[PDB]
Amino acid sequence: GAMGRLNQRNINELKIFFEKAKYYSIKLDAIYNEYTEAYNDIMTYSEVNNVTDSDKSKVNQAISILKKDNKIVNKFKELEKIIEEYKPIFLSKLIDDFAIELDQAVDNDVSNARHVADSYKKLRKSVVLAYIESFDVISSKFVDSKFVEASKKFVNKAKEFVEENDLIALECIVKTIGDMVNDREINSRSRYDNFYKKEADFLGAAVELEGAYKAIKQTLL
């Protein structure tokens, strides 16, 4: 009756969320890929004047690359948009604050550049966690208590995996959810044996979550 109907509503909300946010990991990679050299030129610049690693010129170009067309802010706003209905309240202001920092960044100020760079790095990890927060909200509404338990453990292991590599953790998270809601078997194969300690436990969390979601599905057709 109501329980069968609330199971279906929960499953529809998870699928709608996943499909709307299909490109979350790909789009966040694209930001990271475009701005890694600008980030590295800021970070590696040695205040010892540089040691055969160019000079203050490279930092100014890196900052200008970050500001160009407000591209990076727009790309972050695109990700906020994709989880509009579930996003943590902190995310919008964190993107705004970063956008303001970027306007304030002037030439020949390596400290400010490193700071702008540091807020870039934190925003990345924060945007990863906004996706986990978004799934946590959705999964917490589930009436099936076994799925909620598997979701709590999955979020836990997802968060620990994010501390090791935020963008790989995000990729595996988006893969697992996408597979599960498209009735594709989860691939529990590790791709980083003897590198990321938190991958195996996360893929285990994913298999148990698959188990609990399959079991709800079996009760709907």
Domain boundaries, the chain: 1-221
Dist CA 72 CA 50 (whole Å)? 27
DSSP one-letter string for the chain:
-HHHHHHHHHHHHHHHHHHHTTTHHHHHHHHHHHHHHHHHHHHH--TTT-SSS--HHHHHHHHHHHHGGGHHHHHHHHHHHHTTTT--THHHHHHHHHHHHHHH--SS-HHHHHHHHHHHHHHHHHHHHHHHHHHHHHHHT-S-HHHHHHHHHHHHHHHHHHHH-HHHHHHHHHHHHHHHHTTPPP----SSTTT-THHHHHHHHHHHHHHHHHHHHHTT-
CB 136 within 8 A of CB 125: no
Resolved by: X-ray
Residue 82 makes CB contacts below 8 A (sequence gap 6+) with 20, 21, 23, 24, 27
Name the nearest CA neighbour of 101 among 75, 120, 88.
Answer: 120
Given resolution (angstroms): 2.5
Structural tokens at position 95: 């993107």
> How far are the Cα atoms of 82, 123, 203 from residue 21, in angstroms, in the given order?
6, 18, 20
* In contact, 53 and 46? CB cutoff 8 Å: yes
Residue 144, helix vs strand vs coil: coil
Q: Are 94 and 101 in contact (CB under 8 A)?
A: no
The full DSSP string for 178-203 is HHHHTTPPP----SSTTT-THHHHHH
3-class secondary-structure state, position 81: helix
DSSP class of 83: T
In sequence order, the 6+-apart residues with CB closer than 8 A to the CB of 11 are 181, 213, 216, 217, 220
